[PDB]
């Protein structure tokens, strides 16, 4: 584990210090369908024509990125995503920019968003939730060792692959930080109390977010919800969580230690680190090496209608990929 991580950091740092750049071009891809939408961009299913491979292409409108003050955050995403390498992260295959847009081509996960299946099915059994949670635990162990904070864990950002395993995607708020950082970012339901209270925070906020995810996966709703974000933040800072009666003894206990406002007590943030989580009773049945190696049978496996099947994704209004004849925001995105 410690040896694997050391070698992993060696691989990462080389790519981190000399990022790949301009490794493709738009018209090497056939744009097939919009798989999802964001405030400054969208993700499309595309086919790489020279290989016939299907990919997910994140298209970011440079002007919109600038307007939402996400320049540095978008540079973080691309710089981190091109450097990392882990089974449960969507691999960044290519990146490039043109006059109007930034492009990040990643591995296509045809199983769709966890969000979709979690909402439809209602909730996951504890073994089902545990299976996904373990992959997140390992992914955060990997990311955090690289001094990376993830900062946007949620079902919407957890893609299911052909084998039913998780691919963490969307690194817009990912940041390589040693020490505290301060940006107010994330999704309201998943914000740690630190973030809400403007304290300045560290990777512990990812472990709190793990608590929210596990809860939501197992309960079918998150531990803090309301109609408006303000109401949600009040609940998060309150220091109170109720568990459904069907939650096991062990699960309740894992959640109390994950969803812990006290940093000195929050699991993942103690001297023993992520092993407080790994060695917890709720994870007793979990074979961590087996999960990393993907030799564990997935509780749910998506329907294989074929390559580039999008039936596990919702339908979004398709929209032009317009490329201006003038270069926009050249200086801002120079290093992309």
């Amino acid at each position: 584990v410690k040896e694997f991580l050391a070698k992993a950091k060696e691989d990462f740092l080389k790519k981190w210090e000399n990022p790949a750049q301009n490794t493709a071009h738009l018209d090497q891809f056939e744009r097939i369908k919009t798989l999802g939408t964001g405030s400054f961009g969208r993700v499309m299913l595309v086919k790489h024509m020279e290989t016939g491979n299907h990919y997910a292409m994140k298209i970011l409108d440079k002007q919109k990125v600038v307007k939402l003050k996400q320049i540095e955050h978008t540079l973080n995403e691309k710089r981190i995503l091109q450097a990392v390498n882990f089974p449960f992260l969507t691999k960044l295959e290519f990146s490039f920019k043109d006059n109007s847009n930034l492009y990040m081509v990643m591995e296509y996960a045809p199983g769709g968003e966890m969000f979709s299946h979690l909402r439809r099915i209602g909730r996951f059994s504890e073994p089902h939730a545990r299976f996904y949670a373990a992959q997140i635990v390992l992914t955060f162990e990997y990311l955090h060792s690289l001094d990376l904070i993830y900062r946007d864990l949620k079902p919407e950002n957890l893609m299911i692959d052909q084998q039913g395993y998780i691919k963490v995607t969307d690194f817009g708020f990912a940041k390589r930080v040693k020490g505290r950082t301060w940006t107010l970012c994330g999704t309201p339901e998943y914000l740690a109390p630190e973030i809400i209270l403007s304290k300045g925070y560290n990777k512990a906020v990812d472990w709190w977010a793990l608590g929210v995810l596990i809860y939501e996966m197992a309960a079918g709703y998150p531990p803090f919800f309301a109609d408006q974000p303000i109401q949600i933040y009040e609940k998060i800072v309150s220091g109170k969580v109720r568990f459904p009666s069907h939650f096991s003894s062990d699960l309740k206990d894992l959640l109390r230690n994950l969803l812990q406002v006290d940093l000195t007590k929050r699991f993942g943030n103690l001297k023993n680190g992520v092993n407080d989580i790994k060695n917890h009773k709720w994870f007793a049945t979990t074979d961590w090496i087996a999960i990393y190696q993907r030799k564990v049978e997935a509780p749910f496996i998506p329907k294989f209608k074929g390559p580039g099947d999008t039936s596990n994704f919702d339908d979004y209004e398709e929209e032009e990929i317009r490329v201006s004849i003038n270069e926009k925001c050249g200086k801002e995105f120079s290093e992309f």
Binding site: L184, C185, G186, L191, G220, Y221, F225, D227
Partner: peptide, 20 residues
């Protein structure tokens, strides 16, 4: 029930990130 309150809430759809 809590499930009923969630499903009746305006935040069962995809949740956007926050910023500033």
């Amino acid at each position: 029930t809590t499930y009923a309150d969630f499903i009746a809430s305006g935040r069962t759809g995809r949740r956007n990130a926050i910023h500033d």
